[PDB]
Design a protein around this ligand. Structure first.
Ligand SMILES: [Cl-]
Lengths: 120, 122
């Protein structure tokens, strides 16, 4: 639907959804805080996501600024659903049992998650 | 110096979940189980078994004159790690974010909800 998307694309997309509008050079800067990717490798991620229809762009200055054409929450939920079907036999509850049985969740985190369920 | 880290493809997960369910399974046991749900060939399936063996995820003992495959990886550990990477890739690292987006979007009757409450509290 909001179709396939690779690990490195998730990173570009995440920067865009958080910043709302971002230039190439912005994306390169943030990406490069945690990744040793060259500008060309990054610029090619922007190019594909633009071609695939995931993001678009306005020309503020003579400078292109990219923005999402995909709803963040929709593509993340769909992705999570493919993932849960792939790994955990199609059960979200299995995922949570696994996580909880294994992380040493702090009381604040426990409470937050309670607050999340209790919101209907 | 630990062995090379690998990702597991969707079709490798189908194989590994059969291995974990059966504890010990031959190539023929796996082929048959897989074919019940999927139209993949014997060659295809043996290719997945071979890839997982080469990757270190599974090994084999010869009972009778027949290879029997078993996991080298604890199921809950590997699925947790896989979940953590996936949360770090998609959700900025917030498990809370994944749970949130999933409650905002599924239609959950409150008996789905409760077993989650009890996964928390218990
Ligand atoms: Cl699209």
């Amino acid at each position: 639907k909001t179709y396939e998307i690779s690990s490195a694309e998730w990173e570009v997309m995440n920067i865009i959804w958080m910043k709302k509008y971002a230039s190439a050079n912005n994306i390169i800067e943030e990406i490069q805080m945690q990744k040793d990717w060259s500008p060309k490798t990054i610029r090619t991620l922007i190019t594909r996501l633009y071609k695939k229809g995931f993001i678009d762009r306005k020309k503020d200055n003579k400078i292109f600024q990219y923005y999402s054409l995909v709803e963040e929450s929709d593509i993340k939920y769909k992705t999570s659903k493919n993932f849960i079907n792939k790994v955990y036999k199609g059960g979200f509850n299995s995922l949570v049992l696994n996580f909880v049985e294994k992380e040493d969740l702090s009381q604040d985190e426990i409470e937050e998650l309670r607050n999340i369920l209790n919101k209907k």
